Structure 1
Amino acid sequence: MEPNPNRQPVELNRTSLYLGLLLILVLALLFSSYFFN
């Protein structure tokens, strides 16, 4: 097929990886007590 001209590459730089993993892990550390209840 003819290529779609609207495609764009996506990026996540290393600092964003670290920030995101921190957010997820800290949110998990916070909510896990309530999931176990």
Structure 2
Amino acid sequence: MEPNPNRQPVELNRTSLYLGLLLILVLALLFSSYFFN
């Protein structure tokens, strides 16, 4: 009946987006030479 009071929203600011995009992009820049071989 009740709509599950254990649910909190999820936050991701612009700066954590920028740090995450930087991490994924330089990980791909480091590892693409090894994936290509």
Question: Is the structural similarity TM-score above 0.5?
Answer: yes
Q: CA RMSD for the aligned pairs?
A: 0.7
Structure 1: runs of 5 or more not aligned: none
TM normalised by structure 1 equals: 0.93
Q: Percent of pairs identical after alignment?
A: 100
Tell me how many residue pairs correspond in the alignment: 37
Normalised to the residue count of structure 2, the TM-score between the two structures is 0.93
Deviating 4+ runs (over 4 angstroms): none
Residue ranges of structure 2 left out of the alignment (5+ in a row): none
